Amino acid sequence: MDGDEQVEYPLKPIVENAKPTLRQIMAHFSDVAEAYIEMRNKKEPYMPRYGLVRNLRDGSLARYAFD
Amino acid sequence: HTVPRIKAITSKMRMPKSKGATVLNLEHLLEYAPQQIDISNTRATQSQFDTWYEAVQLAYDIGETEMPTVMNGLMVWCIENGTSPNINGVWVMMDGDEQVEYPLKPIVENAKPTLRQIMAHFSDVAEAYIEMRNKKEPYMPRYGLVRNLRDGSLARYAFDFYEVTSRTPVRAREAHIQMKA
Amino acid sequence: EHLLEYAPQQIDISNTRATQSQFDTWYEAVQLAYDIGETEMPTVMNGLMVWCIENGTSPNINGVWVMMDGDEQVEYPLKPIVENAKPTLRQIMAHFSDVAEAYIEMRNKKEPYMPRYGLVRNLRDGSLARYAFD
């Protein structure tokens, strides 16, 4: 995102050089993601789309609701 | 804070070149857009069709004001039969429940390269004639009739000298695969 | 040593494209046979690619190919073109294969354009037509 416009990047290099799996390597960011979600939830009701569409409804828990 | 955008690499096109000089003329190429109907290996060139049409006129010895009638029956005759008949023989037309015949030697001998590849000029019109006939009776050309085919509506695309372009329906386009198998 | 910097383009070392010498002989020999000035031959080859898109690349040795001047036909003998093409007309005219994509895309931007080869090859896809010549 650059000021209400979209820039795109190819996804082939990202999801192909991720051994063993993208989940098991991007989990390095899982610790920081809590800080980002908490910061966002301090200005608006923020809920990640994963736990959003997982029958879940709790708000405060949203800090722990990504894949 | 410029959020780097993946740089775009434009793979430069490779013009054919001889002795360090481009062969294609890029200018003329940008407006050289002829009809698909024109540049084909099926249809005969306008010169070859002109020679055939003129040579047939001299052999039959018929006035140019009346020849349109003669060629009017030539297309109809060639729909009902093939486009590679016997060199020696006749084709039949019609004046009120009687037959008039014309020798077939001049027609099938001055047709370069082949009678199919030169009579295909009539292939566009033949669709209009067949559709008109099918609007009053179940009409089927004898070629697709005896080619294991049974479809009725398709009959507009079931003669021997049919040429195929980009505007033929897929049902018509896939049909010629099976008949010409 | 040399192997660490010997990195030529893939376009160059192929068994499909003809060598620059063989393409040079064909382009020069056709010029002598047709007897056309080098300043005007670009026009002639401009229609040769378009003609070979609409048909195959293995036609009859004896015959003609058609070009166009304002709804009229001009023909050129096909014997010199298909006889001085070593090893084969397909393997030497493939120099034009890169440009042909640009021409087809330009045509398809104004009408539904499909080369007659892929047209009569059981194929039906439209956007793919940029990659459907012989």
Author numbering:
A (entry chain Aj): 135 to 201
B (entry chain Aa): 42 to 222
C (entry chain Ab): 68 to 201
The paper states:
Potyviral CP plays a role in virtually every step of the viral infection cycle, from transmission of the virion by aphids, virus assembly and disassembly, regulation of genome amplification, protein translation, to cell-to-cell and long-distance movement. CP consists of a highly conserved globular core flanked by two large extended regions with a high frequency of structural disorder. The C-terminal high intrinsic disorder region (C-IDR) is partially conserved and packaged in the lumen of the virion, supported by the helical ssRNA scaffold. Here, we show that we can control the shape, size, RNA encapsidation ability, symmetry, stability and surface functionalization of nanoparticles through structure-based design of CP from potato virus Y (PVY).
In this study, we found that the wild type PVY CP can indeed form three architecturally distinct types of VLPs simultaneously. A comprehensive analysis of the cryo-EM data revealed two new filament architectures in addition to the predominant RNA-free stacked ring assembly (VLPr) that we had previously observed. In the absence of RNA in VLPr and VLPh, the C-IDR in CPr and CPh is disordered, with no traceable cryo-EM density beyond A222. The fold of the CP core domain is conserved between the polymorphic filaments, except for the conserved RNA-binding loop S125-G1306, which adopts different conformations in the presence or absence of RNA. In all three structures, there was no cryo-EM density for the first 41 residues of N-IDR, exposed on the outer surface of the filaments. Beyond H42, N-IDR in CPh+RNA folds similarly to that in PVY virus, whereas N-IDR in CPr and CPh takes a different turn at K53. In the absence of ssRNA, the N-IDRs adopt two slightly different conformations, as seen in CPr and CPh allowing the formation of two different types of RNA-free filaments, with the stacked octameric ring assembly being the more stable and therefore predominant form. Interestingly, only a slight change in N-IDR conformation leads to the formation of another type of RNA-free filaments with left-helical symmetry.
